[PDB]
Amino acid sequence: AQNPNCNIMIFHPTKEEFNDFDKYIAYMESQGAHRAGLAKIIPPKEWKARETYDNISEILIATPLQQVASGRAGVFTQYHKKKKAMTVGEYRHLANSKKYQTPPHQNFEDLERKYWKNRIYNSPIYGADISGSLFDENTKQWNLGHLGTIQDLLEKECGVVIEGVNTPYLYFGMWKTTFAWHTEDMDLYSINYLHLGEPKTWYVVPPEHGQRLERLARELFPGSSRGCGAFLRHKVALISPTVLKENGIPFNRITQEAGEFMVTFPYGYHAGFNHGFNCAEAINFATPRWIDYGKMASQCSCGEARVTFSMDAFVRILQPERYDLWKRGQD
Ligand SMILES: O=C(O)CNC(=O)C(=O)O
Ligand SMILES: [Mg+2]
Ligand code: NI
Ligand SMILES: [Zn+2]
């Protein structure tokens, strides 16, 4: 069995290997990359996502989210307070202000220590989940706006044509902006490209050990657990690496820098934080190996998780017994 310790693998494809996205994902899996839940892909040196980032300041962040924390430094929840719209240029200035800017630090490990010690005492503002793309239309390789759609994968694998679309989303981050512990909708893959700016630190639990994380989370968030049998679908809970280590949960960590892709694999729980002003782009995708994970994915039916239009068909076709109850949560 390849990669039996479930380490995060880093890949350096040549320009020739960067032509066929599906084929390269399958190659990474042949080497055991999926066992970690997360892989890093460094694009060939010839490749670029677009020519410059000099003209992005007029993108609108219609609903910036202030991420307010409750709990203790290593075990907390966050809620998202909606703020007034602002442009990317306004947001960048805000991120760089004395109130929100990255502190002085020695290296990524020192910054990680400062994040875990101090995150809860601040409420950073995240421009998340903005439909759109920063890939140039002429970028032919690994262009996250030109991937094969999950609807077409389901149709190719299973023969059933379904409604729905699959488009990318932009994330504009600042110091301490946080992504809570989660898997993807329907336990899909994700791919994330860090277009510009400061790094993003990721934490991930191997898919084969995801239920260990879920059991800890039920212990650490006991009211939330009673409220919903899949409350990590709410994307609000944080647990630090120190706490994970104290409770014996297998995980790994890695820092993504600008110009790098990360791939999350089906049922790979992940969480993380941004080091400073940055912009990422991400989208879900599927392969034939995902289908069995989609069929088994948990679902939130309490009403909190509220998701996209396109998840309807996935539930309806892959999970017909759950469909009725899940849809009641959606309506
Ligand atoms: O970058 C972020 O804030 C969160 N992104 C992801 O969870 C992803 O790409 O799957
Ligand atoms: Mg612009
Ligand atoms: Ni994710
Ligand atoms: Zn729920």
- Strand ranges across the sheet with 178-182: 178-182, 269-274, 200-205, 252-256
Tell me the HSE value of 182 on the side-chain side, using a 13 A CA sphere.
20
What CATH number has the domain bearing residue 298?
Answer: 2.60.120.650
Q: Is 257 left (phi over 0), alpha (psi -120 to 50) or beta?
A: beta
Technique of determination: X-ray
Q: How many Å separate Cα 220 from the centre of its chain? A: 22
Rounded Cα distance between 259 and 42, Å, is 7
Q: Is 192 annotated as a binding residue?
A: yes
Rounded Cα distance between 134 and 279, Å, is 9
Rounded Cα distance between 262 and 38, Å, is 7
Q: What is the resolution of this structure in A?
A: 1.5
Coil vs helix vs strand at 252: strand
Residue 162: both structure tokens together: 């379904």
Kindly report the backbone phi and psi dihedral angles of residue 39, in degrees, each rounded to the nearest multiple of 5, phi listed first. -140, 150
Within 10 angstroms of residue 118's Cβ, the number of other Cβ atoms is: 12
Q: How many Å separate Cα 35 from the centre of its chain? A: 17
**Residue 72: strand pairing partners:** 75
Coil vs helix vs strand at 170: strand
Q: Is the CB of 190 under 6 A from ligand 1?
A: yes
Residue 173 CA: nearest ligand 1 atom is: 3
Distance 62 CA to ligand 2 centre (A): 14
Domains of the chain: total: 1
Coil vs helix vs strand at 200: strand
* Probe target for ligand 1 pocket from 147, 171, 172, 265, with the most ligand atoms within 8 Å of CB: 171
- For every residue of 37-88, DSSP letters joined together read SEEEEPPPTT--S-S-STT-TT-EESS-EEEEEEEETTEEEEEEEE---EEH
Q: At what angle do helices 311-318 and 320-330 cross, to 10 degrees?
A: 150
Residue in 126, 127, 124, 125 with CA at minimum distance from that of residue 62: 127
Range of the domain at 57: 1-331
H helices of the chain, in order, are: 21-30, 88-95, 108-118, 150-158, 210-220, 222-227, 241-246, 290-296, 311-318, 320-330
Residue 192: both structure tokens together: 């994330």
Q: Which value, in Å, is the radius of gyration of the alpha carbons in the chain? A: 19
Residue 128 CA: nearest ligand 1 atom is: 3
Rounded Cα distance between 262 and 284, Å, is 12
